[PDB]
Design a protein around this nucleic acid. Sequence first.
RNA 1: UGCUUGGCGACCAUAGCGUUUUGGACCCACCUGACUUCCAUUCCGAACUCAGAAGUGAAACGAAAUAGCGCCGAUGGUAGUGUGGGGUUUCCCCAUGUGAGAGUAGGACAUCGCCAGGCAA
RNA 2: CCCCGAAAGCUAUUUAGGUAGCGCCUCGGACGAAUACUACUGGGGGUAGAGCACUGUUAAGGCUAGGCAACCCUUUGCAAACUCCGAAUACCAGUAAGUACUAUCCGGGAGACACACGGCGGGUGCUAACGUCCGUCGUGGAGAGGGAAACAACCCAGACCGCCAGCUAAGGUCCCAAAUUACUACUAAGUGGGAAACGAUGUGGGAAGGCUCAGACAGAGUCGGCCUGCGCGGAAGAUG
RNA 3: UCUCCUCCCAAAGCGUAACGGAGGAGCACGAAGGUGGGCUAAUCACGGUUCGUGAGGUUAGUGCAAUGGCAUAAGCCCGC
RNA 4: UCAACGGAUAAAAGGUACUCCGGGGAUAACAGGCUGAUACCGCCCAAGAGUUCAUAUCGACGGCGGUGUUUGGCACCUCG
Lengths: 58, 78, 116, 54, 92, 135
Amino acid sequence: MATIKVTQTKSSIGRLPKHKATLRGLGLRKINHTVELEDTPCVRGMINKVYYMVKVEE
Amino acid sequence: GSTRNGRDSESKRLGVKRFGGESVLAGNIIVRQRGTKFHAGNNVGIGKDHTLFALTEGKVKFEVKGPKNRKFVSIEAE
Amino acid sequence: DKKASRIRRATRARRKIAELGATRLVVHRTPRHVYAQVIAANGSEVIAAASTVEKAIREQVKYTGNVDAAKAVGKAVAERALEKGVTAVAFDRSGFQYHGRVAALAESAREAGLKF
Amino acid sequence: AKKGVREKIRLVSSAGTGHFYTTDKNKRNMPGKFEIKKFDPVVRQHVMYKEAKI
Amino acid sequence: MKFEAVVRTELGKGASRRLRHAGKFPAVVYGGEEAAVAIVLNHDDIVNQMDKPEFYEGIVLVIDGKEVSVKPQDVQRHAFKPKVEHMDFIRI
Amino acid sequence: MLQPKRTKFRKVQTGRNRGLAKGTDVSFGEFGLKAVGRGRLTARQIEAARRAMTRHVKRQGKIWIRVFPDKPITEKPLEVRQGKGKGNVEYWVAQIQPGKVMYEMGGVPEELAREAFRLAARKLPFKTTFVTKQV
RNA sequence: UGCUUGGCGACCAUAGCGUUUUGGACCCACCUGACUUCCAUUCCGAACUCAGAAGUGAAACGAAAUAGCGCCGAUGGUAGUGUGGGGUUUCCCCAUGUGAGAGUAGGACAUCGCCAGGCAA
RNA sequence: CCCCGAAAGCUAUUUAGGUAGCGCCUCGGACGAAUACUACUGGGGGUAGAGCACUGUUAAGGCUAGGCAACCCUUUGCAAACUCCGAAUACCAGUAAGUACUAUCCGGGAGACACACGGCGGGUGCUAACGUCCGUCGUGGAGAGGGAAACAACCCAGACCGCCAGCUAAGGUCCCAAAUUACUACUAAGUGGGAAACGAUGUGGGAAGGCUCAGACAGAGUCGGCCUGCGCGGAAGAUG
RNA sequence: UCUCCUCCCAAAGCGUAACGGAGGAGCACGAAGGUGGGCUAAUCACGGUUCGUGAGGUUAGUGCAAUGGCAUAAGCCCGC
RNA sequence: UCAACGGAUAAAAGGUACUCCGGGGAUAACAGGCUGAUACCGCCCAAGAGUUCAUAUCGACGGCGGUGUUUGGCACCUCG
């Protein structure tokens, strides 16, 4: 319900195509870029998809 | 020094064309099959090649029914 | 098993009638007695029903196993279904040949105004 | 290779419309001229049709 | 024979495997009316006694402080190593 | 040398040999020879090991061969270029995974079994272990 | 109000078979008769069919009982596997997610609707 | 100079190093979320696995028709073209949030239709090849920078330009060469810094066992297995 | 070898290559099509100079490959 | 049976060491490269042979490596 912050920590070069789409869907654009997003099962699911290259702050 | 083999037919693009829950118009082919791998249930016709197609508009429903536990495609009114 | 054989002979029509979604007039026939039910399309609920085990038909007829009885039952079930607003039925022989009592019942149910 | 021996024939309307169906026959199984009722579209009626060549 | 048993909090492949790396092994106790209990046993302890016949006749498992008489019901052994991967104990 | 008396199909795609064995328990005898390694056991390899064992036991006790070579293996002939169809069946193999009890022995002393099995083990292309019937 | 039977269904083995027992009030079944011929036999009234009702529940059928056989079936583990890492890379492991098949404990001798009949309320 | 940016595929071809339509690029126009990602819901699976109920194939024993042994029974395996079963994923569809100029349609212009390696699933091959043929994802192609001595295709990471600023990735921190100290172990082999079966009182750890002050082992310990870490031999090539 | 069909390879939607693994087709049928009615296999056991009864349950059948189907048969017989 | 099956013509076989041109290291022959089935060398087990006795010498049935070293595989370099 409340907004979480999500940073991209690793590159999106070479990532599976769907994983790149997911980053686009979180609104992440470059390394160290942080987005604030409403915490949602949907937003959480995207994060789970790209956990290896995304740090969450709650 | 040769192969007696070499041959194969063209793939016949069989299979489920509209899955569970899909909205179909009357006439829409649902399944293309060889024999009745799926049987025709309510609001579903069966062609000469055992093509199942929607007799009415609605939603495709698969269902196991009957004493043999056979799969049936029906169109549900929705 | 005679009953199974008969039920085998019945299935094709009964399945068809179900597919057509028609109101069905099912006829059972036993050496003594004869029966007629009008059943909804669902095949679960009976709309109208006549037989020689029923007191009113049993009294009005001589033997229950006769072709004369089958004419009574045909007439009864038809009248009772027409009361229920059942017009146009599909006739389920139930595996008996369309003949003798079964056809007699059918004819009487046609004469009374059931359309088939 | 071709193993087909069934002779093609033209069935012709017994009305003088000249409408013909085509088909084939095994000439051994059917030596005589084939005859069969078929809908003639010109006279819009089912009439007898009889075999003829081609 | 009496063995200490600890009730498993974490279950499944990743946990089961970690136990086995730690010299313990997942096991389950079931039978009677009580629900099946998932327990950890010490491998060396159990395996050392599995040569004795009495082991197969009956042992006591101290689970959650409570002594429970159980017979060995099933053993899953390693493919080729002399190890035990899992045991089923049926309450006696 | 063992091979199927007949087969549905003369040639078989290579495939893979992943997994652990199914028949991993001494089910007929008292002692068995179990595979620790993975590999193909040829029919020749199987018979070499069987002869080794049998000679040693000296017509005492029973031996169970629990592996059957039923996978035909083809080789291209020498001085043939790639192509013109799959090669000819040269030999049969049995796919061995870790755990597979390949042979079993009974009605002998355990020490004689261990020796018989060590001798057979030396004819085989992967590692093995002596195993006993268990409760 | 039951308790039964008959018809038509739902459902399609936790429902099934097998075995045992039980039932004729009705019903159901077997049954009786069929040059006289409605109808029937690629021969036969077996079946189909018709006219019947003396007999009998023998068979069948229904019901009950029976885990005997099938069926169902956890928990736990195991296999595999999506993603990301690692390796000793013909094959594996680790983190996380998912998670069988087999087997075990056990379950189970169905549940339900409409109509009609008999008995009994 | 600025912006975008492929393909080495499919189908057909007297075609195979050509060409055509399609796929992929671009430009204009129309259209506007119909698209992608995720959660949830609904689907169909017959793959991995597994299993032996079928079809085959396999072992032992029983029972026995037959003439040793069917067929059955019990036990036990195997399967690309077996299945009583059966995932993960993927795909199809719906619902919904957030993010995104997405999707689609009609026109102008192409280019390409020799692909490569790497991962994963496979066929072929010897589970050989910097081999070959597919599927799928990545990179190269058309991609600089850092690492991997040097090294298209691996790891990290996408270069608008300038800066004698700072933080980090992979990878590193004795000297070449930018950057590390402390502590705890193990290894003695320059193992590290090529190579297996197998061999061996090398050595470290763990959990048991046998035998022993009624005397073990060759007057106090001793013997042998198991689970494990690290080492040794096995180990021969041509300019240095 | 060249077109077509079936299976496998093919990675549980579709599709997917090799001078990869296996087979088929280049027709047949005026009924072997339509429909109404009817019917239900294989193989054994046992008794009889094909017949009867039982078991069994489709292991049969399908004009012709394989695959998927098929008892309400799509299999088998007959009338029109 | 336009079956070369999207079907160049209605109508078509060969030779060239007498040869020619345009190309290709897209593609063979030499040598290099990769690979190591094969080969060669080594080793493991030890059936046995060896009067007796596995191991003086030899080493069946099988197994594991090394070399690049035979026979091969591939088509990476080179056909201005």
